[PDB]
Amino acid sequence: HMARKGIILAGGSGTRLYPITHVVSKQLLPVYDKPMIYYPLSTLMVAGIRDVLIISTPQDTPRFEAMLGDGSQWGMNIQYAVQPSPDGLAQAFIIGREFVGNDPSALILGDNIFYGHDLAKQLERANARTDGATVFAYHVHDPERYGVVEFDKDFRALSIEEKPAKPRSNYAVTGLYFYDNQVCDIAADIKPSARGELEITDVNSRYLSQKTLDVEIMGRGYAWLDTGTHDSLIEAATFIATLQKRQGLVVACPEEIAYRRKWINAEQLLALARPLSKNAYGQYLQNLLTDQVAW
Amino acid sequence: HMARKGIILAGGSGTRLYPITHVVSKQLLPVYDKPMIYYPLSTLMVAGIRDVLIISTPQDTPRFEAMLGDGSQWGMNIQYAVQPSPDGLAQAFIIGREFVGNDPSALILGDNIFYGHDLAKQLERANARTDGATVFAYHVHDPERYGVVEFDKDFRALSIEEKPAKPRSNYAVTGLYFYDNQVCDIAADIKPSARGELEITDVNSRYLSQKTLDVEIMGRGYAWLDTGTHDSLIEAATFIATLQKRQGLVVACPEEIAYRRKWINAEQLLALARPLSKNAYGQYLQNLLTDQVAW
Amino acid sequence: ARKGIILAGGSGTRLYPITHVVSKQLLPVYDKPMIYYPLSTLMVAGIRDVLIISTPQDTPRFEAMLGDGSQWGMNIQYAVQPSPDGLAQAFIIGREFVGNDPSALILGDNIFYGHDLAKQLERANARTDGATVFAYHVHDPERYGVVEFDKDFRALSIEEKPAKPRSNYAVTGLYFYDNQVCDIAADIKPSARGELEITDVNSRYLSQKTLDVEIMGRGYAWLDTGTHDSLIEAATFIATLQKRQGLVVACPEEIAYRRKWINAEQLLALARPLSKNAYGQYLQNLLTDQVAW
Amino acid sequence: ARKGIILAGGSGTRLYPITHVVSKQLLPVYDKPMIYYPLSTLMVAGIRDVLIISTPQDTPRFEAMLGDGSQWGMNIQYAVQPSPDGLAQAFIIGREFVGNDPSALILGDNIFYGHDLAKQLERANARTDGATVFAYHVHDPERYGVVEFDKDFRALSIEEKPAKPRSNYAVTGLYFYDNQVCDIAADIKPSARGELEITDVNSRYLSQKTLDVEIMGRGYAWLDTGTHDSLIEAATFIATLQKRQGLVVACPEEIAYRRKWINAEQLLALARPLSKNAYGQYLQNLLTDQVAW
């Protein structure tokens, strides 16, 4: 009976991308054909998480709620909470403490895109763990802006350093973390860092010192994209666009995932699609009931 | 003393791009490094128009106002009005009738990008006309979704047909129109078309029958981009991005145009830039005071 | 020891004029020539003996590019196809090359990318009999061989460019065969469109109940480059991944080194004359960059 | 009758391996080979006599592509550059070709696009003495000749790749010259970097007070393609414009027809063997598509 509680952290001071983020939050902006936040929401749904808390800024949380609602249209439970100030990833587990309660949980960042073959099998393995924590390591060209994993010769994780001056490897900790029921108390016990933030690296290092942290390599066959620059936002959009145009399939379509997980039935999906029948996205939903696709 | 009144029509039912436009209006979405509406706002400013009325939907007009304010930060006058229902381009001159008053005017669409050499000279020539109307004709591959100009052998405009089944040419009327003080009364006199809209083509055909319509060809050396599909939105963004990265210059930067037109002075521009000093856009503003550029 | 064939011949004039005097598979996909990608796919499958088939005009160009493969601890040979008379003709041109060994054919303009691709190719390479092809959901299946699947995705038929495709699953341009294929290819007759059809070869294995049709899931990119637009899209796709990762897709030097077909001294030697460009710097950094494999 | 030179020789190995066996200026920019663009720029200037300079290895490839130009009512000849020893060497290799006429040099990998470009090139082509070059604001001027401008944008100096560039204006890769240039190029000596410098030729005209330095404004695209990324960016830029307009950039057949260098019967004849691809269909539609010129 594993009902993991998912958190999407979708706040952030939001100034690197000025002026496109001046009055619209980054995680509501389009990545090709759908808002950014559809992708990490979909990642949680593909992991099996059906209870999702969306955290954003005081000003933008009504905007996320106007877009996703309570999630019942997708047979899910989506709730909202605000982060007054962007004081660190680990504050998600203080703001989301009541939502998490006594259950296992997962945190994903609202601007992180995960894509690749067998991603579901890897997320389901992380979701099924009853103890400890699971994070993922991914080779990037700029590891120094992330938590960086030091690996021994067999890729067992030895340490995690947040934004090291000399990174021990190129493997960054991705923005997706699975935890057991210790994390809320761990997050409440840690102190702000020199840069003034409650550090997810400190949470992860606590599990590491207990020898209960699983650090899974996300291989180069996966795309783990964040979108920190105007250029990389375009690059994520064209990357998504090339795949969808080639396949005739949509990445991170929550209606599709909900239907495939039996969270909604064929009548409900048709009901979502009928008012969207005049656009391409509604046509894809309509065609899910006829097009044989391996899932 | 030519103080032309500019209107940006930035409403629209907004469903072709679902779901990216579900809770954010299309004209607030990014085209590379800045919101879409910066481009037609800039076009008006490059034409010399300093008084701008922004029309959008009831729901999104506060959003445009939160982003542009009253324009005094750029030494301009920007006002707002709502379109309850998207009943046609020519309704802009009913909603904006009081704003226009007894002055000449210009209408530009909130999702139209205009770019090219000597665009300013062409817009200033259209702006300086004391009588009649000036519209622009542009060769597109899909003229049939636009007002289409029929030309004689010397490219004198003979007729304009809105969305013809068999287009007489490939020249579409762009989404930028200059009018004398007849347009508000002309717009109030016309009747909705079979498709239920107050047609700008009917306004333009009225000037045409008076022999006071100037139809100027916008040559293929210009980019006139609207962004009707997910694909063409990306294509406009990468197009802008290639030029700006090559030149080290920004397209449709309103601060720059305001400074160059002496609507704001060096102290004011520095003041806009100082709180933006941590991002690339603020660095470009800061560098306008030192970088010698022909304008 | 499976023998690989890369079919890199005449693609027609659809892309005119970019292919007017340069064969398509010599043209860049972002940062390296197109044929590097299917070459790398064969190497990832473990195939070390490769026959490159091209037009007579461009065989010295492919040979000038890849050499005999000994620089990567491989064996690369060349053969010509005077006229592009069908995929299955590769097994006539390469009959001597294949001999009595198993083989694989890949198209010189097909890109394959995704997680665990190696595990799937090694499983196909390790089969002792029959054939393996892969099925991939595309929006325009009718320009390919199309797989008809039952409810359990068992393959029932393969039709070359059907008017009404029975599914959206196209047969990708990568095929593994046992020692029957050369004799089969020699036995089939030109089709209505005048070509020796890989679909007829594959349909033979299916009717013999020795064809494995494996789904290549949507987590994979299977890209060909049949239009000017899709050539661009393949280039920007690769570019997004390499810029993000700091890693290069389809770097044959890297693959040979990781498979121990060449050692560090040989890799440094390949790198030194390239030290002034980014590609040679990437090879040099392979000796220090810890990458999981 | 001004004589045009396209310098399309050796660019080094920065783009390795995409240029390893194919010269860069034969490679595609979206839908046509790179050299089509500077070729078209010369034709838009009115230049009808073109010398293509390339490496010895690729001169048959350029010639296989463009022919003698008589198919477009032009005169196209070929010459080789054994070693890439400087832009100004084009006027030594092409000394016989230029003779006593005026000339223009354009780089085989430079793209020029924008409104009224023709009016500007025709004004340069119509000058009776001196030289004309163009200055363009770029983010990395230090990799070019850089123009020093006074407050009125009168040119004061040109420095080749200065450490501290005096402005952001680079000299673009398109130059118009009177009959002095060949003798000047024969007179200059290799520079510190070992090249015969176009900046030394241009600085000679400036000191003689016969150099016109014209700003090419930001409304123009002046694109070279020195990196893998910028080659992609040039391709997607062209693609965005052609898809929007239904028009093709740098179509030599179109330019020759509009300038009446070939007539409709000759254009139909060029089109007929290409009727099965989009390029030949575009030529055919030129006879019906009313386009302002």
Ligand SMILES: Cc1cn([C@H]2C[C@H](O)[C@@H](COP(=O)(O)OP(=O)(O)O[C@H]3O[C@@H](C)[C@H](O)[C@@H](O)[C@H]3O)O2)c(=O)[nH]c1=O
């Ligand atoms: C700090 C913070 C960020 N955010 C948002 C803003 C961004 O969209 C996103 C990440 O912001 P950043 O400043 O980059 O956080 P960050 O600097 O903490 O980066 C993190 O990145 C992870 C991927 C690594 O695994 C971590 O180890 C860590 O490096 O989260 C919040 O909403 N609230 C916050 O408190």
Ligand SMILES: Cc1cn([C@H]2C[C@H](O)[C@@H](COP(=O)(O)OP(=O)(O)O[C@H]3O[C@@H](C)[C@H](O)[C@@H](O)[C@H]3O)O2)c(=O)[nH]c1=O
């Ligand atoms: C009709 C309408 C549109 N809009 C917005 C929505 C879009 O962003 C933009 C244009 O919407 P459309 O449905 O395409 O309008 P449209 O169908 O009227 O197209 C017009 O296009 C011009 C370029 C041509 O010159 C005209 O002749 C005409 O063809 O204006 C409004 O805000 N209010 C309205 O009343």
Ligand SMILES: Cc1cn([C@H]2C[C@H](O)[C@@H](COP(=O)(O)OP(=O)(O)O[C@H]3O[C@@H](C)[C@H](O)[C@@H](O)[C@H]3O)O2)c(=O)[nH]c1=O
């Ligand atoms: C026919 C042929 C093609 N080719 C080249 C041209 C192209 O680069 C590439 C493919 O050419 P086409 O005309 O598309 O081949 P094709 O039309 O035979 O396509 C094939 O595609 C496969 C992916 C499917 O599995 C097959 O079932 C089949 O549909 O191979 C040759 O070199 N020689 C030939 O004999």
Ligand SMILES: Cc1cn([C@H]2C[C@H](O)[C@@H](COP(=O)(O)OP(=O)(O)O[C@H]3O[C@@H](C)[C@H](O)[C@@H](O)[C@H]3O)O2)c(=O)[nH]c1=O
């Ligand atoms: C030097 C040289 C280059 N080339 C080719 C290689 C490239 O495609 C192209 C340019 O080569 P480069 O090394 O960049 O040349 P370059 O370094 O001389 O660059 C020149 O660029 C012009 C735009 C400026 O106006 C000049 O002032 C100068 O900066 O010409 C030759 O064919 N022959 C040669 O002799």
